[PDB]
């Protein structure tokens with residue numbers, strides 16, 4: 001007795017009420033205390049069809065995250081097409097918290113236990129839980145931060161890999177530490193990545209991509225052009241909006257089981273040139289938000305790159321991928337690809 | 346105009362008065378609502394001498410937690426010097442709360458901003474606040490739980506490392522989640538700790554220790570012997586006193602930047618065999634307390650290990666370390682190491 005239906009979920013967090021961070025302020029009020037200990041009702045002999053690409057759970061998370069930011073991150077000015085809104089935009093404590101989206105009474109959640117599931121298609125290994133796994137609702141483009149990893153091998157996910165327009169989600173097995181910091185220019189920041197570990201990565205990745213492509217020089221190039229949010233690694237570090245230049249990160253061709261990169265430092269590390277912008281393009285809505293100038297002191301963010309968002313060109317013997325992002329729904333497909341809300345009816 | 350002086354402090358809490366958790370009941374009456382927003386008076390060109398081992402802030406916290414427990418955790422019987430004292434020992438709601446220790450009018454607090462300070466010695470990066478940070482008064486041995494982390498690298502702390510008799514406090518930069526549980530034997534419990542995260546941990550931990558030892562085999566072994574409280578990771582989970590076996594956790598030698606452990610399960614998590622005890626040796630005083638039989642139903646503490654309490658053996662090319670603790674002041678030095686009460690006079 002299982003099927004596919006739409007039900008209004010709810011969130012359960014391990015958030016503190018005494019915490020002044022906006023994620024906790026929102027969580028403790030908008031969310032339920034964690035279980036904190038349910039159990040997986042593992043199932044054999046059963047196979048179900050998942051689709052991380054047409055899943056309501058991702059929209060429900062999307063909406064909550066938007067509302068979270070509405071309360072949390074207030075823009076000084078929110079210009080939505082010739083109409084501007086002003087309001088109190090106080091600097092605040094900001095740092096994502098794991099969220100567990102749970103199913104109402106009478107409903108349950110399916111969990112694919114295939115450690116290689118691409119997030120679309122059948123799955124002979126299933127289970128059941130009331131809540132999900134903790135999910136840091138991290139807004140970022142190009143690079144997926146502080147997410148979960150692929151247990152075994154790298155997994156590649158695309159609604160249609162032959163369509164160059166669909167966004168491709170790379171799930172690493174091994175995270176790459178990344179440390180963006182704004183030292184004591186006040187808007188001038190940077191990020192550090194150890195090439196060595198970035199190399200092993202883009203190799204394993206290229207090798208995985210290569211499996212889906214018969215024999216073409218697989219190249220990684222910077223995002224063609226467009227909005228800074230999408231053409232650079234942009235994210236929110238401590239309420240502040242970092243736009244990290246990535247041209248020295250996605251730069252190298254990996255053909256014939258080989259690996260060759262570009263843009264490095266004598267320490268053996270890749271340095272990204274970031275800026276903390278006030279004028280931003282909202283990921284929640286087609287509009288622009290303006291915030292206050294950076295806070296004082298060291299603004300550093302020690303994150304782990306656990307996933308990638310890419311985009312093939314398509315159109316001879318050379319497939320080139322470019323960093324992508326924009327639709328944050330994908331940032332949350334990368335963590336909800338495993339799940340599927342089922343009706344016990 | 347600064348110096349080192351003793352003044353009777355006071356605690357400020359974000360505690361609710363409608364709450365029946367013994368922590369809130371004591372707090373709201375013994376403490377004062379949080380500021381809840383003072384400001385750090387950051388300082389440059391100034392260096393001060395801290396000593397987390399000779400700081401009265403800790404002794405005051407000690408006495409308050411003792412009193413807190415005196416009201417909160419009623420033993421059925423309390424035996425001290427052959428003198429037994431009985432009383433109502435009603436099972437109660439128990440869950441620690443962050444405590445901020447503030448300085449009276451006429452005094453301030455010195456806060457070290459150096460993100461690598463070992464708790465003892467000079468510090469060129471100082472600040473000033475009226476209160477402290479949210480310190481959970483968690484009573485535990487061996488492992489430190491629900492505390493703060495070292496922002497950057499792992500910090501090792503000891504009054505004198507060359508003195509084996511001095512306890513070492515390990516500050517982690519990445520906590521290890523620990524979930525202890527007594528399932529629906531009624532005194533029989535257990536704890537789950539993922540190996541991988543404990544492996545990265547002890548490795549990082551041994552590497553730091555190795556920095557303090559030119560060239561020796563660093564071994565981690567269970568406490569030599571003594572009372573359970575001290576020979577096991579004992580703590581309080583919801584009024585229930587758990588004594589968790591740690592022999593499969595502190596069991597592995599790590600030499601030549603290597604890492605080699607012991608005691609594992611098929612799932613990839615270290616399980617610790619716990620017993621819930623009624624008769625316990627008081628951490629507050631030299632005596633024993635007898636508590637009521639464990640409450641019924643699931644008793645779980647989903648907590649984070651943020652530090653360690655260790656003991657080097659003393660006495661060739663082999664430095665062995667064992668889990669220690671017992672004196673709770675250390676548990677509270679681990680968080681008061683940064684602070685130091687100064688007179689503005």
Ligand SMILES: CC1(C)CC(NC(=O)C(=O)Nc2ccc(Cl)cc2)CC(C)(C)N1
Pocket residue numbers: 139140141227229230234235236241280281282283284285286287325326327328
């Ligand atoms: C909803 C929307 C208008 C948003 C757009 N993407 C963005 O501007 C965006 O993520 N900006 C952004 C990203 C990260 C952070 Cl931390 C702050 C801002 C992608 C398209 C244009 C497809 N639709």
Ligand SMILES: CC1(C)CC(NC(=O)C(=O)Nc2ccc(Cl)cc2)CC(C)(C)N1
Pocket residue numbers: 484485486574579580581586587625626627628629630631632670671672673
């Ligand atoms: C003051 C004292 C008698 C206390 C002794 N340590 C303890 O009994 C102790 O931690 N007991 C204990 C610890 C944790 C919990 Cl949850 C319950 C009981 C350590 C020293 C040597 C300082 N002498």
Ligand SMILES: *[C@@H]1O[C@H](CO)[C@@H](O)[C@H](O)[C@H]1NC(C)=O
Pocket residue numbers: 152153154155173174204205208
């Ligand atoms: C990393 O992913 C590759 C395939 O993408 C896989 O072969 C490898 O096992 C993963 N990491 C490890 C465990 O080496």
Ligand SMILES: *[C@@H]1O[C@H](CO)[C@@H](O)[C@H](O)[C@H]1NC(C)=O
Pocket residue numbers: 160161162163164
């Ligand atoms: C994938 O995209 C290509 C190119 O747009 C399209 O022609 C093809 O029909 C798509 N295949 C699937 C799986 O729908």
Ligand SMILES: *[C@@H]1O[C@H](CO)[C@@H](O)[C@H](O)[C@H]1NC(C)=O
Pocket residue numbers: 195196199259260261268269
């Ligand atoms: C990977 O980066 C490391 C960092 O020093 C470098 O030594 C090595 O040559 C690189 N290998 C590649 C690009 O395949």
Ligand SMILES: *[C@@H]1O[C@H](CO)[C@@H](O)[C@H](O)[C@H]1NC(C)=O
Pocket residue numbers: 220221222247248250251252262263
């Ligand atoms: C790669 O980076 C170099 C500089 O490090 C740059 O000159 C070159 O155009 C980049 N190649 C691309 C766009 O892939």
Ligand SMILES: *[C@@H]1O[C@H](CO)[C@@H](O)[C@H](O)[C@H]1NC(C)=O
Pocket residue numbers: 231232245246247
């Ligand atoms: C990153 O810097 C390079 C070199 O200065 C520049 O060519 C590139 O356009 C930058 N990326 C963005 C989008 O700012």
Ligand SMILES: *[C@@H]1O[C@H](CO)[C@@H](O)[C@H](O)[C@H]1NC(C)=O
Pocket residue numbers: 095096138145146235236237238301302303304
């Ligand atoms: C990623 O998680 C780490 C650990 O919680 C945190 O320090 C870092 O700031 C996070 N990065 C963000 C905010 O995306």
Ligand SMILES: *[C@@H]1O[C@H](CO)[C@@H](O)[C@H](O)[C@H]1NC(C)=O
Pocket residue numbers: 146175177302303304519545
């Ligand atoms: C960052 O990644 C490293 C390597 O996997 C890991 O040890 C650490 O716990 C990660 N921190 C976060 C943000 O979870």
Ligand SMILES: *[C@@H]1O[C@H](CO)[C@@H](O)[C@H](O)[C@H]1NC(C)=O
Pocket residue numbers: 463464465466467501502503504505506
């Ligand atoms: C900590 O560093 C100070 C110097 O700032 C040094 O005097 C002290 O011995 C160190 N403590 C230990 C034992 O690590």
Ligand SMILES: *[C@@H]1O[C@H](CO)[C@@H](O)[C@H](O)[C@H]1NC(C)=O
Pocket residue numbers: 302496497498499518519549553
């Ligand atoms: C903790 O310190 C270790 C080395 O001692 C380092 O590798 C790790 O990145 C640190 N964790 C952080 C900075 O979160």
Ligand SMILES: *[C@@H]1O[C@H](CO)[C@@H](O)[C@H](O)[C@H]1NC(C)=O
Pocket residue numbers: 567568576577590591592
């Ligand atoms: C842990 O359990 C073992 C038996 O497997 C026992 O010998 C040991 O004494 C226990 N822990 C301690 C040190 O009390």
Ligand SMILES: *[C@@H]1O[C@H](CO)[C@@H](O)[C@H](O)[C@H]1NC(C)=O
Pocket residue numbers: 566567592593596607608609
């Ligand atoms: C370490 O633990 C193993 C079991 O995992 C046990 O057999 C052995 O006695 C322990 N050795 C010690 C306590 O050094």
Ligand SMILES: *[C@@H]1O[C@H](CO)[C@@H](O)[C@H](O)[C@H]1NC(C)=O
Pocket residue numbers: 440441483484490491580581582583645646647648649
């Ligand atoms: C740690 O905090 C968690 C959540 O507040 C709580 O459930 C747990 O009891 C705490 N750990 C202990 C045993 O103090």
